[PDB]
Symmetry: none
Subunit: 250 residues, 6 copies
């Protein structure tokens, strides 16, 4: 499901194939919108976990004071609000894949607790004495510079080497503009299959888009396709049908 001819994307496909059917921890690195969660889900369905659960954890969205409960579960009465006993993300991911979205935003207290769980392959729910087994395949993703964070003392070096066994780097769209035509075909095909609209781009428009910086990378490209299908339904998109900020000629 990863479209393109660039050396970068070919490399990524080759690396995914190498690691997918192992249980090795994968760290996917790349700017927002470069397809890291797509890569994680693809890996999962081509792994030994492919018949098991795929469980995301958005490390920087969950309140720091609640993340321990979210990851590890809690027993009734463990804290204010805990009036039921509930399984956490690790328990839910057992026999499957645990996907750690933006691992660089995980608080230090949880970084160390995660590492112990990776080492011991056991955990306790918050408020519980019961040591439970876990068997999860780890996939993590980040757009941050974890090496700098280690230097800054905001990320744990021992966790880093445990997670970063098989790194996969996703190049930004601006470094692989040769794939834009193929990406657009796929985006347009999806839209048409789902009966949400139809457009196509002429070569001048494609040339213009290949000169855009794409701060939001492929997600930004997808957003443009959606928008154009409203502005010019069933239209052929030339340079003049592009929003001004996407027009790059000379």
């Amino acid at each position: 499901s990863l479209v393109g001819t660039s050396r970068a994307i070919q490399q990524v496909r080759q690396m995914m194939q190498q690691v997918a059917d192992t249980d090795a921890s994968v760290l996917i690195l790349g700017e927002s919108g470069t397809g890291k969660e797509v890569v994680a889900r693809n890996l999962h369905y081509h792994s030994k976990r492919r018949e098991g659960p795929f469980v995301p954890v958005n490390c920087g969205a969950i309140p720091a004071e609640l993340l321990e409960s979210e990851l590890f579960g809690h027993e009734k009465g463990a804290f204010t609000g805990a009036i039921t006993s509930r399984a956490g993300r690790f328990e839910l991911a057992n026999g499957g894949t645990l996907f750690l979205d933006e691992i660089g935003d995980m608080p230090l207290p949880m970084q160390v607790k995660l590492l112990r769980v990776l080492q011991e392959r056991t955990f306790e729910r918050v408020g519980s004495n019961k040591t439970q087994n876990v068997d999860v395949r780890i996939i993590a993703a980040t757009h941050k510079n974890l090496e700098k964070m280690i230097e800054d003392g905001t990320f744990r070096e021992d966790l880093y080497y445990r997670l970063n066994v098989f790194p996969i780097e996703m190049a930004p769209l601006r470094e692989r503009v040769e794939d834009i035509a193929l990406l657009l075909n796929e985006l347009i095909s999806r839209m048409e299959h789902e009966k949400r609209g139809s457009i196509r781009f002429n070569s001048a428009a494609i040339m213009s888009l290949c000169r855009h910086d794409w701060p939001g990378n492929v997600r930004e490209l997808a957003n443009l396709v959606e928008r154009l299908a409203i502005m010019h339904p069933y239209g052929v998109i030339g340079v003049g049908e592009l929003p001004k900020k996407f027009r790059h000629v000379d």
Copy 2:
């Protein structure tokens, strides 16, 4: 119902027409009082959802600890206070429009949960295992700088590109003062139709109002009309009948 001759408002009318009868997510951007909820309701009644429910969500008014329940519903016993099982805003908006008022005030934990619902088109009530379908057309509104918030890590970039498919910007009143006479006619007509009073403005007063900054935009203008209909019932409003802070001459 959007009055005026300005290029800005003509553009807005043209854009509403382009997107209304699609199910594309609309993001309405503008200062408080610029008519964003008016635009949302107008879109709804000219959409494929026009015979369905229009359900507002005030993202920054709802307590963060209760917003999950409010959006997604809850089962009996899900949390302290949950002694009944209730449908949330998403369930209530099914087959209609979900209007997200000030989306920039939605907490990060809910930003990500919202995004998953947009992606999977399914949700669970709080405390429930039952995966339910949802079919809602999304309209969101903000007076905040979401791009800056992305930079600050207070708003999710993946949610942003999912919501911001068709942006509609509402210019502040101070940037479209040519519409003030027409706006005033409409405001006065509404007041008179509802038997709440009657006034009219002379040209000197209108000139004075066109030099006002209107921090509260059209809502502030409406407030002035109401106030004047009390201070000068059935009166003709000149410069001298305006409150001091609205008097701008020379």
Copy 3:
């Protein structure tokens, strides 16, 4: 479990033997990845505490505002969130070993409270009047320069001399490259025993690795073994099978 022929590692083994079965406080000094926690656990299982608990404290991971509770325990209602009364790390380590990971990151307020506990061999839970006994063997570890911190006023000199009774220095991998072949054999044996893969290195690759700086020391070496077992499963690793940054020839 400490592999190698270097004078350094022989010295370390000799020193561990001298101190393990005493209850003397041990300070282990060394860069990240030099095996300090391995040394601590080894000491524990060869100590008078070997049938007791081994309790880690990650001094720089725990929020400073929560560390007092974490170390000393708390009574119900001691602070916001304390709705149960819980034993801390000191209480949990009674009759065993308390391992202070990165003691240089412990906040000054807790440095002094720790010292009093070392002196008086008693503590109170947060919010409690009850003076409790503690009997723990202390092992601490740091990658920081505690002597400089004393000069800077960021570490307590009285605590330093109390902890630093028996220092054990771990040399960085780059200062003991003669041990790399033996380390690799052990790493590979562990991987194979655990059915996680299999590789072996030829002499040219080993020579190349002996010229690497190893910023992450032995943990970085372990990470490379894991990675290579994916890239070249059941392969013989030569210079060309090493990632570029590990290739050092001429």
Copy 4:
């Protein structure tokens, strides 16, 4: 409990005797490890406060933002975190001795508040209107140059003359090396009484130690005894059994 024949230590003993059973404020001056807290505790148990509490305050360890609460106590709700009403160090020291460890590290705002309490013999808890009585005997200690700090504006001159009624200076170990044999006997006796080990030093080793600079003074000397009892259990310590940095011959 202050061992030695030096003129310095005899003087100190004579001065302690002069002031102990008065309630006069004592300032103990000396490098770290010179026994200032030992002197303070000795004074206390030979004072009119000897049946009362001895309450330490580590002025430079406590967060500046919390020191007011720590010294003076607080009422419920006084600040963020104050969900109980608690007595401070002054209240706890009533009828006894308040020991101010490193008074030179007390923040200026608290220096002045302390002085008012010394003058008025009354205080209020943080957030309270209730004026409470206090009767404490003050003993303070510093390794800093308070006279220079007065010049620098970092210590209050009015507080200085209030605290410095009876100064006691502790000479560094390097200025009283004639006491080292006696100090070592006492240190070794304590270790043996507590069943923690046994050593003794020959005259050559003692001569070598008398040429050491002792940056950590008596605490550093105590640390060496502990360390040697591990390295050479029940051994006789000669020059060769000393760590290299303590070997001083010629």
Copy 5:
């Protein structure tokens, strides 16, 4: 309560009498220990404010970032930490005397805010719109050269002339050594009345003290009396009973 026969102290007494029962701003100038706060309190109890509050402000002790709150009060939520609404020193001094200790250490931002309050006789709490009345009599004190500070731009000239309506200069002890015998009698009487000890000085000791420079002025003299009452309880103090640095003969 101002003892002595010197022309200087007679002048000071005469000037205090002139200004005390007026509400004129008084600036007391003098080295540390010359009795400036004694003079301020004396003025207050012989003023029109004598039944009102005497409220000190230590301008150079209070953190600059907190001084606005300290002087003017704050409303709940005004800043980080403000979870209660509290009256400041000005509000507390209403109907009484506000004593500004070391006014030369007041930050420039607060110098100007103070001046406006002196001019307008009104203030607002931090974070508040409510303009409150204040009626305080101002007494200020400094050991600094305010005229030089004006030249340096570190003190406001407009504030200076507002505060410096009635200056009172306190001579250093070394310029009024004829008062030392009388000062000592008063100091000794206070000590004896408070049952804290008893001494008296012979004429040779008094002659010696009259040749001392007294860097700490009268406070330093008081400190010596306290110290001597410990060293020579109920003793007659001659030249030989004085500490060496106070012995001045020939």
Copy 6:
């Protein structure tokens, strides 16, 4: 309210009349104490802004790091400490007068930002995208040599010509001693009206004062009147009742 017969003060009165009811920027130049803020306030109450706010800015008192916030306002979270969104001096001065006290002490970074606001008549709060309108009449004051500062690169020449549209120079008191009797009458009348005292000067004292240099100009003269009303209440002030430094005869 500007008293005197001198050609200088007559000129100043004539110039104030010329410019007051215009919105032209006024720069008032003069030594400290020459009545520049008096002139600014007088101008304001005789201007088109006379029913609007008069808002002072003390350019050299406000911390340079806070001046941007002070002038322009800030949004919540703009910087450390910004937990509320607040309007700045420009916003507060809208429809009125902004008085820039000692404009020569404004930092260069703010000089340029001020100039842009003068040019564009718009500003943004710190941390905000919202462009706001401002309509303020500018009055500035300085005792510095702005022409020299331009040469030194410490003041902006483009800002200088924008501010210096209508300069008004205030002569020092020593250059208009013919006005001293009239100034004294006014000062004494104010004091008596406010029931703060009463004095009058004989001709010999007035002659003496006319030979004084008055480094603090009229403010220093006012200070003397206040002081004399304490020293000689309801007295007639002759040469002998003047403080020595004001006595100038022969």
